[PDB]
């Protein structure tokens, strides 16, 4: 769908992530000199000694479909969670008047990839004009910084080693 | 823990669901247990669901909602429902025909 949309033009609307630590950073997703992350993604972790329940609403007033790219975080040890998200069992929920999808993180041990043994799951939600987006997590939320514009047009994507 | 067998000679269709509360307290409030659980199975089937507590946008007043699910039991099989909360159980089965029908989105008048 991102291929068929043919445009990564990003609106950067701002959320109020009050009570948790914004802009995350991993040594496996470094930005030049030190740690860094995904440009279009926000990594939230405890405030200081806690992780309150997040409830952010972000309506859509423009006349076009908005595409939200978010996700959840999966720690490696039952303590890696505690460590990050306080609660011992996260919970993420993204919905609209017509949508809704909820995810719980899976704690475990994956193979060692680029240092890290835990990882993230990427999801998407589109909200049609005249509907609101709602996020409600009490842990592991890897929130989005805004929406991608949605084109209809005539574009695609192809695997090819032919030089242009 | 309920069981409801199927003796008739035809496929029975069960339409049920599970309820998702807005707050970790709206659960407590309604289903006591801090975490619902619903299971609907048969000798060959089986499907279980756990509620996702949270805040959905305001719809028709409510900020919580329900998740609709289905289960059919072939003649000579039994249906089994086992929930400790949030169960939106069914009052019976729908008949299952094979025939030649369909559905169409149209605004043309009959």
């Amino acid at each position, epitope marked *: 769908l991102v291929a068929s949309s043919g445009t990564l033009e990003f609106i950067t609307e701002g959320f*109020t992530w*009050t*009570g948790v630590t914004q802009n995350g950073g991993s040594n496996a997703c470094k930005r030049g000199p030190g740690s860094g992350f995904f440009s279009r993604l926000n990594w939230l972790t405890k405030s200081g000694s*806690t992780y*309150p*329940v*997040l*409830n*952010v609403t972000m309506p859509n007033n423009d006349n076009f479909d908005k595409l939200y790219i978010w996700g959840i975080h999966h720690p490696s040890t039952n303590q890696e969670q505690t460590s990050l998200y306080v609660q011992a069992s996260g919970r993420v929920t993204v919905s609209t008047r017509r949508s809704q999808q909820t995810i719980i993180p899976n704690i475990g041990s994956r193979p060692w990839v680029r240092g890290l043994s835990s990882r993230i799951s990427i999801y998407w939600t589109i909200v049609k004009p005249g509907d609101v987006l709602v996020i409600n997590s009490n842990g592991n939320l890897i929130a989005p910084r805004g929406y991608f514009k949605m084109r209809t047009g005539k574009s695609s994507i192809m695997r090819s080693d032919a030089p242009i | 823990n309920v069981t409801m067998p199927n003796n008739d000679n035809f496929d029975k269709l069960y339409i049920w669901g599970i309820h998702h509360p*807005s*707050t970790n*307290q*709206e659960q*407590t*409030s309604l289903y006591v247990q801090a975490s619902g659980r619903v299971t609907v199975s048969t000798r060959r089937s089986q499907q279980t669901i756990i509620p996702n507590i949270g*805040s959905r946008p305001w719809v028709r*007043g*409510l*900020s*919580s909602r329900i998740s609709i699910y289905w289960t059919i039991v072939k003649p000579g099989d039994v249906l089994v429902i086992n929930s400790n909360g949030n169960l939106i159980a069914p009052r019976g089965y729908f008949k299952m025909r094979t025939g030649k029908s369909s559905i169409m989105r149209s605004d043309a008048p009959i």
Partner: antibody, heavy 120, light 109 residues
């Protein structure tokens, strides 16, 4: 500490200004819920003083606006009460709390509450 | 603007009686914006019934709940030493949130 804590003086002289405070812990008072002040008099009669939801500077005070005036400090995540010019009539127990609301549901949080005394 | 009046204001009964509180109301309120609070001395009102008839996270069975137009109720299967306190029906219809007086409840012994 992880709910609501009232605060302020135990007293003041009729006329000065009263200035309560509630310290919430566990929810950005900007994430839903209506943060309100409720007090009951010596005679034990609960009176609804008003609010201010996540909805921001809304306040949406009662029918004694003249002075009941409320604030929030998102940063510190805490909200306040003024009542301006006070009398002895106004001496009582001041409670702060948050309500949930839903057409099919309702659920609140309150507080140890603070006693203020208006006298000289 | 919308006055509520709970009836006995002060009353008593015995461990086992069928106790019943009421609460009238200036105008009408929609069966889901009326609640009840159970306050004991030194505490703070504790919620007891939302949407006119559903017990809040703990209240025990003996408490039924009800109410229609401009008139509601409470009710207890039996009555235990414990249930002994005061009650206030709350209303959330129109904006000036109300509460009215309350109905104290002393016990017998």
């Amino acid at each position: 500490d992880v709910h609501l804590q009232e605060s302020g003086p135990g007293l003041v002289k009729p006329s000065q200004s009263l200035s309560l405070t509630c310290y919430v812990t566990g929810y950005s008072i900007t994430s839903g819920y209506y943060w309100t002040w409720i007090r009951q008099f010596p005679g034990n009669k609960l009176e609804w003083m008003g609010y201010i939801s996540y909805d921001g500077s809304n306040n949406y005070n009662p029918s004694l606006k003249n002075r009941i005036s409320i604030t929030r400090d998102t940063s510190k995540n805490q909200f306040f009460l003024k009542l301006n010019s006070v009398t002895a009539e106004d001496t009582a127990s001041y409670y702060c709390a948050a309500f949930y609301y839903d057409y099919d549901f309702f659920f609140d949080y309150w507080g140890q509450g603070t006693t203020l005394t208006v006298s000289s | 603007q919308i006055v509520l009046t709970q009836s006995p204001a002060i009353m008593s009964a015995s461990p086992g009686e069928k106790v019943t509180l009421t609460c009238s109301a200036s105008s009408t309120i929609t069966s889901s914006f009326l609640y009840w609070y159970q306050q004991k001395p030194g505490s703070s009102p504790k919620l007891w019934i939302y949407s006119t008839s559903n017990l809040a996270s703990g209240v025990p069975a003996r408490f039924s709940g009800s109410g229609s137009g401009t008139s509601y109720s409470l009710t207890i299967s039996s009555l235990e030493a414990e249930d002994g306190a005061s009650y206030f029906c709350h209303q959330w219809e129109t904006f000036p949130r109300t509460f009215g007086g309350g109905t104290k409840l002393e016990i017998k012994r």
